[model samples]
Target: GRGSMKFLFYLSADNLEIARKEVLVLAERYGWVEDYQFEERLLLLDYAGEKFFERLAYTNEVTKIYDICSVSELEQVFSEIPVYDRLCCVRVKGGKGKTALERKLGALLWKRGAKVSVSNPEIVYKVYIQDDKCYVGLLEFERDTRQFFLRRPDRRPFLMPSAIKPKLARALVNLTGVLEGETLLDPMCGTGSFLIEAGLMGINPIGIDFIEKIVRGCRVNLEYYGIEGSVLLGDAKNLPLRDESVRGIATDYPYLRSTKAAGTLDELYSKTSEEFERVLKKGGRAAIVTNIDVESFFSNFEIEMKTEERVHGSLTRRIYLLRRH
Candidate 1:
């Protein structure tokens, strides 16, 4: 017999590649089959049993699941659920305006439903009004979530570091398959930004940098947010991890002429490929943000080229998606 089952899929705002991977792992681990995914938010899952729900309760990945209800019966029905006391949102479609139709609908629910209870109802319910349809979602606490890199107040005073922007981070992490509890290694972890983003998505990160000062700075930034990760002083050419230890690798390789090593770019690329092949697990993926022409160099390793995008200008960062064979 199938009882009422609840499901929630979390999308990575900072790094969707990592976020989606985590979602897949959770879905498989708890036996919730993927029903559908709409641009990241509207992911529907078929719950296997109470065991699935129980597993969700034990993990912090799922924020909340709304009991299905109609717009007319939303208030009364939601009252029975546990999110009346939390801060809720009325999410309209991207292009939709807050017109008379929405106001009237809100009034109808507010007039007949129970009082809005504070101090106890989960978080607030987010009313998602999409194209010709509506959904009410109970707010669940997003565990280990990160703040938008551009929005960090402390970092705002300084020039935004030249790494992958938020949009690209979302794409890279979403496309790659780095999941929760899995290890994401950033060999060139500058200031530990990527590791922080990975941690928020429920993935433990190991950040390595040859620069001692940068490693120290990364630790400071991570500690300030009360986030946990292992940021070590190490060389990317000879990563400290054992063979096949890392699940995914997201890195911004050094490309400045001054920062360039004594050897040619080809030599550096070969060393990096060797290190990645040694550390990355079978079937794992690597997303690299580099300023140099790395097309030929990437072929040296037994990796399946996934995708590449060129962001124009002086920075000219090329994002390469690679999967280990």
Candidate 2:
């Protein structure tokens, strides 16, 4: 007597496309992707697997739906409401009549022999109205987005100007579609942001930094977070591993304007990406970020997804999600 559960994901629109992809990739990784559709920033999913919301880095809240009806049919469907717990609360979101709808639904629940509690409720029934369709669900989980803030670059043992934010780094790692216990490499890990994020997700993180100081500092930062990773001083163009050794790759290319590089920016990207393609397994993914447009460099990999994030008025970062051919 088991059926697919309808779960509504309240997504964050900070980076809508990337955020949406993160959810899809994570769902496929967990093998829970049954049927899904989006309305505005909300994702309605009929899931078959157990709870895997903790692995999500971009979702704001999740809810389990027991009944769904149009805004006009809410009253007619009131008798069909499944109130498993007596001490419950009715909350409404979206649309113009949220406050009135909450009170109306709460009164209906109270009249139907259910205890209504506003401050503290054993079960919370959430009603979200979007596009004239009403989605009813029970509150399941709210992601702790503050955890990413707590792990910001300023709080790390080693800090760098090019360090990616913990949230974005986690999202990039998820973009790789690398499951837990798989190996992920960060070829040009400046401060080990990707490594720390990957390691936190139970993935084996391997990093190679060209600079010695950065390599040591990256290890210390990893230690600070209690994340185990292999951080080494090596060139990205010539990695220290066997061919097709890594399951995935998540890295940010260095600045082209910096004078420490051995060659031009084009040469660096070309040579380093060759190593990346060589080390990554067939069908594996690679998430790469760069300050400039480097799409032409990846000849061996298929461009799965590409997007740009504007940092400042004149600076922008291009992100590429690549798959091995």
Candidate 3:
């Protein structure tokens, strides 16, 4: 005997394209059996063998699979299966009423001798009904680990709407792998957006800005998000920190047109690069987003490893992922 199960990968729907690409990349990297992707709501995969699902369930950052479609099918697929396990149903839909659907699904699954617990469930079965199609699966399981899926801050009220994209900030922080209790530093922390996201993920962050007004704004924003962090008015070109102090650095470098500093692009890049090398600890990485072309700017530095590429948009910004020696 065997059963079928489904798993859902949730993401922010604001930037659907970016979210889909990221989810696809993650699925490919982890060797997930890709079933289908419906916009940004849900991604479906088949868990043939119990060991594959078990491996995914134990990962630190991944959500669990809770329900198997049929226990008999699962047993037939993988021998030595566990018996009479409970499952929770997760309905993926658009246009509100998700909570109501969840409750209804719980009731339906309950009649089948399965337990239902929204707060925490051993097996989570998902029902994705979007565009008139139904997707059903089990949720992966884990113990004592925090999972961040489909949780994002409201972005409507920010003065600079372009600056508050938490997904981008989260992606950058994810690159750091700075888990709970670990610290990250942002020398040019503009408005403290990155710090707030990092703090929410249980990582401490130190933010520094050259302008007092910007630093004040950063502090205010951090407080608004109820995140605890220190923000100081300091120059990134000459940081007031000891050598090799920070675990990782995530920053949005100043664009040539925005800053009032009296220096050419080359001069500004040189100064910032020297300081970045000085503060970043060995084996620490820096993920920087900037509008300037780094190949032209960072030609002088002895770069241990660097990746640069232009992202097209209203302002053609370039992103640099750098690692220290």
Candidate 4:
């Protein structure tokens, strides 16, 4: 009487943390996180409107997605496995025979008069080996997140030493949960990369830079990409907008040392965070990238710190997805 659908996400090994975060962002946006196999690098989610899956921007691949009927017995159902003219591949992995299991599953289906094609298949299935258990599902679509990075020539009208990269910029936008047509703010927008990706995702961005030259560069880059947004000369400690203005905020903040301000790390961070809290509307989210650890600085703000991570050596960028109460 009821039907359920499941999909497998084959994540990027190098950026597993951000990839996972991006997936959760999608789950929260379009569906709910039903179950996950971290070891196998897969997520099983319950969501409506399967077409929305194509909208995801950071996934490595969709290993399998199908209207599923959970099987309690594997061997008993081999005969009932739907037959297709094209070959379907069955991959296996557990305590490690993933190599042999793929072949074994293929053999089982072959003997059952099922056409299993490895080269090209209309329908593909995957058997993820994790939790000491193997499961199967129909293959949907494969994704490569790399394409999003370097989507535009890095050679822009304006560039800076600590400019946010494409990958991180896109991840930050996703974390904000800013949907299409909504507004996102990059108060300290340097070269406009964060706003660029946000624009690509159909979100209008307001990029404010304290430096006039940087603000011009932001406009040039936005025009080059044919994305709509505002580039303003604004303050980091005091944005020009009124209170409760935008849906989200995402920015790669300037370091305390970079600001040339005579203050402790917490002081500078606290001042800027005050502005972030003041402008972000209730239910709005923010992804702030900073080098310093602001564990105590944002204590006064009414927000929920969602997640954080280190970027690279000597330049650790912790992304805080903050939700206003």
Candidate 5:
């Protein structure tokens, strides 16, 4: 019962690759995705499903596409006016003479006997003019981006050092393509940032930390948001789960500078990768973050994608998307 339509995603340009990958995973999870293209900060997608854009974290605005034309041809695009809404408003973004363009379009609509409301409009038409072209469509909705900020580590009831940002956590979870009601494991879950994001996305979150205090604090943080998840004090080197039990895994590896492992950093990552291979189902994906590039450790898994994010001059993080073979 999914409806097929062309959608235009106004992406948050902070990290373009991460944002684009987030949308790609949703498109793959939902249905067959046809002809997708990324032009600058705009993603033109021929994807389906009503719930496709609902859980997206990196996208700013989604539009049920109307038409695309040159900026000078906007008057012709407006002249068609398919069953105009009573209270309609025009919004222009990413172009010169934005206010003038908005007024001109509003005036044209007004001349066509359509009621215009700038303050509160029932139907809002968004116009994005870039490089002499206008991408116009009805505004589906804008993402509640502030939710991520509100869930930051400093604002949480149980604060922990080196906690991942909520937005990045959400994007990493999305990369795993974990569906609702499926199990997502965070074996080295420090403060349960991935678990919190997974639980909020309606996935069954199972978190395991070696430190008892850390496990307790993770539970407190999860409970603060009323997120249902399992938190246990367990070792990543030897997980308690059965073979091929989890559908997906997302975890941030502890930095060697900050935490102590059973042996050397090499041995720690090697053993954890072995455990990750054993517990993750074949074909299921894992998104792992590490302070350094540890691609040589995970031999049993295929590296689907590997990307790096610069945190500061002294620190950078490598993120790997792996599929169990």
Candidate 6:
């Protein structure tokens, strides 16, 4: 049964906002956002589900969002709770300390009613030790980094200059709030990175690009993944799709000088926003990566800016999360 509970999250070391948006989308995707906060690599999320952990590609770990208390305030917090079952600290920043506190906490909970069982127990709570702070919660889910490691760009069949990295590509795709089986689009699907991520997630995606080399290589990369693909040589400025057709959009928009054997960066960015708004369904989300920050460009289309994150460097590509009304 669904109930109100706090959840703990561990974000990737690469990009905090990438995992942040992926975790928060559970609210928009499932509908609830009243309580969510971030502290360091941890995110406390409020959502409905008994188990909803195998989601949002970039999130590394998920546990029931737990309690954060200073060692001084912790004793009172533990005393207020009447039970603790098979509780243990999950991670510690220092090896010299924290185990004594674990024993102390277990002893207190034993008096309350929680039976400590390192082997088998009805409940197991985790306490992560970081300096003077400790977080206690039920450890829930984790993703194997090996999967991502296997899909590294260098390992892919086709490559290009400045292609989006696999992890970031997956993060942007998830930012579109694309549920399973929904159709996604990469209007400027160079190298098929976005489409490849979508296909892996079982999201039916269509890609369009005007560049011949990129368009052909995009399909090659897609096919190499053994993911039946639908990318074609075409213009992104005026997609050949009906209005309100796709569920979501994610793309790395072609950038300044390097992009225009066929179009101006200004032309591409402005017109891409025009088509993105026209083709997206109402309430749909779009994750766009550009070489420069252009919030004002999308704002002209009346799209809401959900979040903005810079990638690589302060002057490099920026990801803008937007929603169509």
Instruction: Count clashing residue pairs per candidate.
Output: 12, 0, 26, 5, 0, 5
Q: Model 2 compared with the native: what TM-score?
A: 0.90
lDDT of 4: 0.70
User: TM-score of every model?
Assistant: 0.62, 0.90, 0.59, 0.80, 0.93, 0.79
Tell me the spans in candidate 1 whose CA falls farther than 4 Å from its real position: 1-31, 37-91, 95-99, 116-146, 149-182, 199-204, 226-229, 256-264, 292-312
Which candidate, 3 or 5, has the higher lDDT? Answer: 5
Between candidates 2 and 3, the TM-score winner: 2
Q: Write the per-residue lDDT of candidate 4 for residues 1-325, one digit (tens) a residue.
A: 4344566776656566666767777567755555654543666664444344454555655655433333334555455666676767875433556666568768888887778777877666666555544456665666655566546446666667767777678878887877889899998888888898889878999998888988887898999889989999978787899898998898886666554653555545777778877888887777887776665666645444444555555556666777776
Candidate 1 per-residue lDDT, tens place, 37-110, comes to 54544454545532322122112344345654544465564445442433333332323464543454445445
lDDT of every model, 2 decimals: 0.58, 0.85, 0.57, 0.70, 0.86, 0.73
Arrange candidates, best TM-score first: 5, 2, 4, 6, 1, 3
For model 2, name the residue pairs that clash: none
Q: What's the lDDT of the predicted structure labeled candidate 3? A: 0.57
lDDT for each residue of candidate 3 in 1-325, tens digit (9 for 90 to 100): 4343345555444444434444443344345443654454454454232332221211222344444244223223122222246534444444456677678656655665666677666565544445554444443432222333332334322344345355567656545545556777888887676787788766788999887877887787787777888888898888888988887777887666654643566666788777877777776667677775675555433333343333445366555556666
Model 4 compared with the native: what TM-score? Answer: 0.80
Runs of candidate 3 with Cα error greater than 4 angstroms are: 1-87, 90-122, 126-137, 141-164, 256-263, 296-313
- Cand. 2 Cα-lDDT: 0.85
Cα shift from native, residue 9, model 3 (Å): 6.0
Residue 144's lDDT in candidate 2? 92
Candidates 3 and 4, the one with greater TM-score:
4
> What's the C-alpha lDDT at position 289 in model 1?
78
Q: Of 2 and 3, which scores higher on lDDT?
A: 2
